[PDB]
């Protein structure tokens, strides 16, 4: 369980937000990187 | 170029600066990657 997602299409500030949300909301992490997957997808 | 550099031991605020550093100086990218890795290795 747990895929390794490459999201290079994010904004520097987006990573800052996303990562902050992982450590701050680790229980939501699944959802936070779910967004990130659509995030890099939107700016691909 | 192509090496995997995991830094999950970095705190959001700290790696935030690292990400913004890559944006500000993508030339030093790898070295900034190697730089932040020092903290990642320390907290490892």
């Amino acid at each position: 369980g747990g895929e390794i997602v490459y999201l290079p299409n994010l904004n520097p500030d987006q990573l800052c937000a996303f990562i902050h949300s992982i450590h701050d909301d680790p229980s939501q992490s699944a959802n936070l990187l779910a967004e990130a997957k659509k995030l890099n997808d939107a700016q691909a | 170029g192509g090496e995997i550099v995991y830094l999950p031991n970095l705190n959001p605020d700290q790696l935030c600066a690292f990400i913004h550093s890559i944006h500000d100086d993508p030339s030093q990218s790898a070295n900034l990657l190697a730089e932040a890795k020092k903290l990642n290795d320390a907290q490892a």
Partner: peptide, 21 residues
Amino acid sequence: QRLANFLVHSSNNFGAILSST
């Protein structure tokens, strides 16, 4: 230039990886 691709192992650990070639 050289940039770092941002990858993450979904469960706990986010990381980086360099990308140029």
